[PDB]
Structures are given as structure tokens and as C-alpha cells.
Amino acid sequence: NRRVIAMPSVRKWAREKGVDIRLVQGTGKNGRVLKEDIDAFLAGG
Numbered sequence: 001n002r003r004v005i006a007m008p009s010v011r012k013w014a015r016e017k018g019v020d021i022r023l024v025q026g027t028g029k030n031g032r033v034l035k036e037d038i039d040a041f042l043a044g045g
Contacts, residue, residue, distance in 0.1 A: 006033035
């Protein structure tokens with residue numbers, strides 16, 4: 001494990017909100033950080 005798994009738009013989304021995928025344990029099938037994961041990251045503190 002070295003590169004995080006997430007959708008390109010999710011990465012941009014996070015970068016836009018100040019969030020980094022590297023700190024988001026996405027649950028997309030294999031652990032892909034989806035818009036839901038990010039939205040949960042900010043609204044899940």
C-alpha cells in the first residue's frame with residue numbers, strides 16, 4: 001500500500017474543501033473514497 005484509492009473528482013473535491021484523500025478511509029467497494037466519504041469526513045468529526 002502506497003497510493004490511496006479514490007475517484008479523481010473526489011481528490012479534487014477534497015483538495016477544494018481542504019481535505020486530503022490520504023487522510024480518508026474510503027469505503028468504496030475496495031475502500032475508494034467517494035464524495036460520500038469526503039462529505040462524511042467533514043460532517044463526521
